Design a protein around this ligand. Structure first.
Ligand SMILES: Cc1ccc2cc(C(=O)O)[nH]c2c1
Length: 145
């Protein structure tokens, strides 16, 4: 199984699924390294973020737990198709790359915060991470190239 993937047991259903401990992705289906990748992301910040401030909100006061709740909500909508990633990144992301549908352009190892870099290189083109934690807050990452 590709870098990071383990079989897990569904607690609700008792059906096996696959969890990726690097990207925090999970899916039912069995899963399937470049110099550069390209990604967008949706950042939800919280009170312990490196900079508890964004274009959306001058003083961010939400807790870590509330941020993770928001992130989970958006992952569910993206996954159900009720909303797409670019749209929720544009409206809700606490990064100013929100202006570019959450796009951050191409990058190699060595430029991004490490949990974000690892998650970004462990994704395949087209794939989305689960919640990725860095000192800026909680990310959903979409690998676009
Ligand atoms: C790893 C990583 C990469 C890009 C960004 C951009 C932000 C921000 O705008 O807060 N945080 C990051 C962390």
């Amino acid at each position: 199984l590709p870098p990071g993937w383990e079989k897990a047991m569904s607690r609700s259903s008792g059906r096996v699924y696959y969890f990726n401990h690097i990207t925090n992705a999970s899916q039912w289906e069995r899963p399937s390294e470049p110099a550069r990748v390209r990604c967008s992301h949706l950042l939800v910040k919280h009170s312990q973020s490196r900079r508890p401030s964004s274009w959306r909100q001058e003083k961010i006061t939400r807790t870590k737990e509330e941020a993770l709740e928001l992130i989970n909500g958006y992952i569910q909508k993206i996954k159900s198709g009720e909303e797409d990633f670019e749209s929720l990144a544009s409206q809700f992301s606490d990064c100013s790359s929100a202006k570019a549908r959450g796009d951050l352009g191409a990058f190699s190892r060595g430029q991004m915060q490490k949990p974000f870099e690892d998650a970004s290189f462990a994704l395949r083109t087209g794939e989305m991470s689960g919640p990725v934690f860095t000192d800026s807050g909680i990310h959903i990452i979409l690998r676009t190239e």
